[PDB]
Structure formats: structure tokens, C-alpha cells
Amino acid sequence: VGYDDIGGCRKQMAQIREMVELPLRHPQLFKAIGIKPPRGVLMYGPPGTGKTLMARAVANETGAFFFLINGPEVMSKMAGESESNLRKAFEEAEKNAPAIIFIDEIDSIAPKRDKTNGEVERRVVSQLLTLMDGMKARSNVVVIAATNRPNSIDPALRRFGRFDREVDIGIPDATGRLEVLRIHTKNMKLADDVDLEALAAETHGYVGADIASLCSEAAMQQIREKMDLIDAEVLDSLGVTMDNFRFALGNSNPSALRETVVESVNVTWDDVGGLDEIKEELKETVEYPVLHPDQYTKFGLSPSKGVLFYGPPGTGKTLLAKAVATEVSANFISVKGPELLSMWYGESESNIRDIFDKARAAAPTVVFLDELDSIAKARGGSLGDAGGASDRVVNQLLTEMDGMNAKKNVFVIGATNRPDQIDPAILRPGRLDQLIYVPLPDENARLSILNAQLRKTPLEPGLELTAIAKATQGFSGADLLYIVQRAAKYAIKDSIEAHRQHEAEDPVPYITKEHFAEAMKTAKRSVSDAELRRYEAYSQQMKASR
Amino acid sequence: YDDIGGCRKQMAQIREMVELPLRHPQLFKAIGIKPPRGVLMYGPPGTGKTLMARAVANETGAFFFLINGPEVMSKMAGESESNLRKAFEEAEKNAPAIIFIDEIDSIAPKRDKTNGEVERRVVSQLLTLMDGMKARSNVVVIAATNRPNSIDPALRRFGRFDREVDIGDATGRLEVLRIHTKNMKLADDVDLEALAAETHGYVGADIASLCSEAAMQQIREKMLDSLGVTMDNFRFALGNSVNVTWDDVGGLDEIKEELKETVEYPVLHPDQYTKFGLSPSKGVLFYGPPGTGKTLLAKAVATEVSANFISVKGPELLSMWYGESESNIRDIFDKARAAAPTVVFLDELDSIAKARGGSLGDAGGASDRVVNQLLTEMDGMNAKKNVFVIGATNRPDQIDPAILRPGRLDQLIYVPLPDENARLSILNAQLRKTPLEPGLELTAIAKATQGFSGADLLYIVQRAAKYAIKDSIYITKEHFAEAMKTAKRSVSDAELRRYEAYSQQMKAS
């Protein structure tokens, strides 16, 4: 693998390239300018970005000797042997022509000295320090490192003369992902229909090996679908369609977020009835920044990020969250209400900051904070442990959602049932801009909800739902779902009865008007009139403020 | 491959992903891509993952090398990493082989929660041996764990553990019973349907021990022609989770019919529901006086399906710590939805929910957080594969109007007090296997109840059995005549008027 194999990161590639090559190629310029070049690099970033690949590329391309050092391979049990191994490695490297040394996973070798209990780790840390910096330290020997946890390294190691510059090999952009796809799909025979540009635009958080996994999975899917269809000429008809890549992309997810993946639930924009205005506003707010950033940068403003749905229970806020998670390109991070909390001290805030760090790392991302009544509450409670942690968590939320961060397209979606109990600093614009009220559907909204729910099911040709929609006047989408469930249960009971009678001696491939009439005589109207009074009072107070 | 049952799709996927490189590499040369070289197996302990790995390593010309978790770890510095390097060099020297590293969660402490240096050193050794310069030359590694979340994110990456296989039913359990009883003639009249329906919670590694214990106990009780196990041997092996079958409950015929419908219909006919294209109802809520038979009704509707039974109590989940009750609720729902189907029995909803509202205190905030965790776990960002939440309280007025929302606890079933015709069925169901007298009249005992409960009838039966065992050390009539005077009637009158008012308000709504 040469430099051509590495792609998606041009600045860092140049940074290592110039230092490793130009001093070994034309030292006349350094002799003329009278300064020696830097001789140390520490490559860091999230796992699987291509650090080892770039090291391999420079090793294979440069004519200088390459020596490989692994992290734990040098450690031993005897007293004074790991340091001997390092000395042997360094002296062997320096004995020959100008060379490159690569200490893979240095964070295993060299943690902070003060925060370790052993002794051999301290000795080997000191040995590294002395080897790289000391009397007659190095001569035409370049050292490169790779790690995933830069902060967990001895600060005495992060100085000029040891690791002169710390290049950040982070996730690539859309164009970088485009070149990664083009690089990986260069050897496999592809079909003409698929266009890699759309795939690169669709993928957001995928880094390096994630794209390699995508390509491998698409090829495997193509092979598996052709291998089962058929029992020399088969080799000629080997082509990977756009459908294979779409399958792989739908079934995949970025590595950093794989543990936070949500179970796939099939919901689409047509599956949610009514709420057309709210649906359109949400679509605008979501896909405007991600699909058209050129307009936003032309106008020189940032986009609104946060949204909050509030209203009676069951009206469809979590359904809208599901619909978004299914029908937006950005990554999704779902969280239950108190799911982040912990009994230990200073861990619920660590939980919040880790999830936000992952979200803003794999941007753009939609974080769905469900049931904010638990996390947010109202800061300044009833003293003691009634507020001791409930305030620290809120403060961490505030400072993570707004303050001392880089704007990186992270949209927080809220969902509550009693928003009057939410801390007022959370509701502020710039944290949760939109205060959307999701009211109980009216007659036409209920008709739309019924049609949406009955999308995929047999219906009698002469059956109308207008009577059902109009005969409620107080119901919610959950109640309409309950009516539909009871009707389906009675219809399937009739079907089982008919099947049993036929066996003893499709009878009903559709639901009937009498089935609906029999099912509807026992309805609920779950939302009470006091809750409606409270919600109306809150909404009109909000409008008065408006 | 003939000794694996139930893991059909994952066994076929692992089989093809191993053998398509091994049978012919010309296909991957023509398609111009490299196959995956990592399988992360996760699931409950005792499923059969290492048996499938050994079966794939036996059916193909590989070399199965077994590496254990706690075996390779030591206290000497640089020795466990040396053992891992020696194992990888031994696997790469001779032939293309199959590596099975078992219990990888013990040697992957995620490098941030641990304090030991040797664990981070062997984690870095695994990441170096699995990926790097000339890392692997035609060798695939397999893992095994119980909790796949306590693994490093660089370990769950592509190239190391790029495939995650969920090895978590009745036909597969019957297949395991057929393949584990293949080398022995058990009998002619043994039906495997009861053995596949009664062992509803067997992981797969207990079925072989069950058949071995039955085959051992048959030879033990019979000490070469006409040998083998019978049904009573399997019954004794199962004896070595409730014992009801639609018969111990008395009365409540329409409630029993409604529960039987709304539980057995989504289990027996999934294909008809996919033809209709609709999801069934889940939640049933009971309310009324105590000592009525709600737990017995839940057990009687759980016992006929092939589901499990997780019966948790109200105040047996609240804790003084921060987050412990919600962690217990999440653990209960995860253990419920990790084995489909499963009916969940939440008792004392009035003690759990409390109609959160506003309390302005630490206990009120803990109650609010418990209620929000329950509301998220019942119907939130989940898949609701097969979860039958059944509630049972004695105070429905202290429930918030969010759990009674349809989709969570929509069935507002009232359980009233039984009558004399129902107490006849209760007394007939309790005295199933009892030596009875032809001179006793259960109708004369049931007519003089006038508002008793199932607990009082069980107390009367227990007093009659105590008098019978006192006379012994059939049941006679004077035991019932002397036990009918010492009744209890623990339920008062005002709770019945309050429950009737709540039922009338629910009917008028």
C-alpha cells in the first residue's frame, strides 16, 4: 500500500510526508536555513482512521530503513529486560542508514508516571524519555507514534524533541469519504447504475474501516444473492448493484456509535397522520442545514438546533421521533429518561458528556432526549440530595448543549408531558429553539390518522371511515389505534371461528362494518378533561408570551 | 452440522462465511474483495456457540485452537502477552486454522474503568495481533461473551470483530432434543412435544444434561434388550415455573376467555396478523379487593403459552441510591424482551406509579424518575417484539393517566368478588387430588360464605387438611363443620364500595 492507497486526509498526509521525505531527499535546504527539522510525530484520533495504514505507506515508499515496535511486545518479567529491548531496538535502528521507528499503541507502554503503582512501567517510561532526549540523543533517526488516548500519556513525553507535533488524524468529510469509496471500490467489478457520490453524501460518520466494511458487506450480499439463485461463465456475470450498497448502508452504522445503535423500527412520514404543519416544519429544520450548507454559509448564520414537543400523552411525539430516525440522513442517538443516571458520584454527568461527545464527533446527529421531566426538572429544588445531583446533571446539560464548544450540527429533540416542570434555562433559544405543541387531533386530523393506520390491510370496497373519525370528537391517536386493534381482533376471531367450522365440517379476507361497530361500542377517551385544561392553560400562557 | 439445532440462520451465515474462502478462493479473486475475518459471538452462557465453532472447525480442514479468558491472564508482567503471541504464532505457523478466544469480556475492561496495567497491555496486544503490519495471513478469529457492551470500541471494529452474531425457540429446542437423543433407542411411545413445550427456559446446554440424567436414572432404577428411557424418566429429570393449567382458577369465565383470546391469538397465528397487518394489544390491568386471584389468573394465563414468567413486586425495586430503581426496571424489561415470548407481572402499580404529579422532594423525584423509566420501557423507542405487561393493583385512583393510555395498559379489566357458583368452582379446583367423602356437600359450604375470598377458602381447605392429618396421626365432614366457624373474612365493606365506585366511574367514562 502506497500513498495512493491512503486517502481522505490531505493536510495530515502532507504534514508527515514533508517531514519524513524532504530532510532525507534534499538536506541542502536545511543546511542553508540553519535549522534542523522536527524528528517526532504522535498520530492520534479515533480508532480505525488509517494511522497504521499511513505508517505502512510511508514505510513502503521511503527508501529509509523501517523498524516496527509494538506496545506490549517489549515488556517482560525479569528486572531490566524491557529497557534492554528498547535499547537494542534503538541502537539497531541507529546503526544503519537513516531510519524510521514506529511505536504502535504507545499509550500502553507509557502512561503517566505519577498515577501508576508498578515499577517496570516507570523504568520503561524513563527509558523512552532518555532514549529520545538525552546526551547525543538521535542522529538522522525519526520516531513516529500512534495512539487513541493522547491525554493518558506522560506530559514529559509530549514536548518538543520527543514528539514535536501531534497530528490529528480524525474522521473525514463528505469529499474525503468520496475518495475513500473510490479507493476501496477500485479492484472489484462494479455495475454502472450505482453512483458513489450519492453514497458518500448519505454516509456521515463512517470512517475508513467503516467504508471498507460497507464495501465488503455489499460484495458479500451480492455474492450471497447470486450464489443462492444459481446452483466459469458465472464469474463473468459478477456485478454489484446499487441495491447491494443500499442494503449494506441500511444494515450498517459507524463504529463509534455501534454500541448505541437502536433497534430498527419501520415508520415513514405517511405512517403518521395529521400534524402536517409540524411535520413540514421539522423536515425543514432538519434537512435544511445538512442538504444545503452552501446557502447557510452564504448568508453567514447558523441554523436552529433544538426542538421540544409537549402535549397530552400518546398524541404522536415519540412516533415523530421514530419517523425522523427512519427518514433522515443524520445519525440517531435515542435515550430513555433516567437511563443516563448512576449511583456513583460524578458519573451521570460523565454519561451525559460522553453521549454528547460521540454525537458531535459523528456529526450531523439527532439526539432524542425522551422524557426530559426526569433529567431536567427545575434547578433549585428542596435542598439536600433532592437537588444535589439533579442540579449537577442540569448544569452539565446546559454547558454541553450551549457553551465553549464548536457548532457541529447536533439537533436535540425533546419530548415531555408536563413541560411546566422543565428548567427555564433549558427552554431558552439556542438550546431548545422550537416550542411545538402537539394538540389532540380534530375531525380531519383523526380521519388522516385512521387512513394512515389502515394503510396496509384489506378493506371492504364500500367502507368509509368518516363516521368513525367524526364519532369521537375527543380521542387521541392511541385511542384510534385501540379501536383498530379491537376491530382486527374481532375480525380474526371470526376468521378463526369460520376456519374451525370448515375443518370440523378465505372465509373473511376483510374487516366489516359490523366488526367496527361491535368493536367501537367500548371506547376509552383516555385523556381526562383536567389534563386538557392544564395543557390549554399552558399553551395560552405561551401564546400570551408570544 | 447435524449436531446443531435452532441456530439455523446464524449457523448458515457462519458456515458460508468460513467455507466460501475455504472451498474456492477463485470467487473472491474474481469479485476482487477480501472476506471478513472476525466473528463476535454474544448471548447467554450455555447456548452452543463453541459447539458451532468446533463443528465448523471439524467439517473444514482447519485447526481448532482454544484460548480461555482467565487461563491466559497471569500476574507476571509480559507473560500473558507472550502467551497470546505464542498462541497466534502457533496458529499461523502450521495451517489456516480457527481461533476461538472464549470469554473475551474478562480481558477487555475498556481501558478506562480498569486500574490494572496488565489488562490494558493485553488489550493492546490483542489489537496489535489482530490488526497491523502483516497482521493476519488467512486466519479468522472467533470470540464469545455474555455482555457485548463491555468490549473496547477498537475491538468491535472492522478487521477484528467486524461481524456480531446474536445467538439467543420451540422448533429449535425440538431439534436439539432430536439430535441429542440420536445415538440411543429411548422408546416407542415418547412424544417430544411435551418435552419441547415444558422446558421453555432451557438454553441448549441443559438439554444434553437432561437427557444424560434421564438415561442415567433409567439404568440406575433398572439395576440389554428392551432398554431405554420412558416418560417418567424425563419427568424425574425435569424435576431434578408455576404449576397450573387453566384449572386452578374458579369462576370469571368471560375474564378467562378474554385473557385466553388476547394472549393465545398473537402466539398461535402470527401469519394471520401479518396478513391483516396489525400489532396486537399488550397490557392488561386488574383492580379490586385483595385475595381475589389476580396472581393466580396471571399464572393461569401464562402457563398455557410457551412464554416465561417474570413476577416482580411493587416495593421490591425501590432503593435509597440514585438510579438503582430505574436500573432494576431496565434490567427487568431487558430480561423480559431478551426471551420472546414473555409475560411480565407488575404488582402494586399504586406503589410504583403513585400518579407522579408534584411532591417537591427527593422521594417525589425518585418516583417521577421511576414512572418515566417505566413509561419509556413499556412504550418508547423500543421494538415491542413480544412483551405482555400485566398489572395488578388494589388502588387504581393513584395511577397517573399515562400508564392507562392505550398501548401500555389499555385493558381496564375489573376483577369483582366471586359468587356462590364461582366459589363452587374454586372449591372444586382446589380439591383436585384429595380423597373425598360422598357425604360432604360443597354447595352447603359455599352458600354460607356471603362475601369470602380465595384466601379465605384456601385457609378453610388448609384447616381441613390440618384436621385430617391430625386425625390420621378420606376427608370427613366434621372437619369442615368445625373449620367453618373459624372464618376470617379479611376484606372489609368500604373497600368494596370504593372499588364499585371506581368501576362505575370507569364504565361511565
Binding site: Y345, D385 | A366
Partner: peptide
């Protein structure tokens, strides 16, 4: 003639954590 060798690898320590009640 034979020879000896010294080796001192590590030991095991104990940490203390703080919890929060409610």
C-alpha cells in the same frame, strides 16, 4: 556452573469509591 536470576513483576492494590444516595 549454574546461575540465578531475579524477577519482580507486580502486586495487587485496593481502591476506594464514593457513592451518592437519595
Amino acid at each position: 556452573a549454574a546461575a540465578a536470576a531475579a524477577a519482580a513483576a507486580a502486586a495487587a492494590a485496593v481502591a476506594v469509591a464514593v457513592a451518592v444516595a437519595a
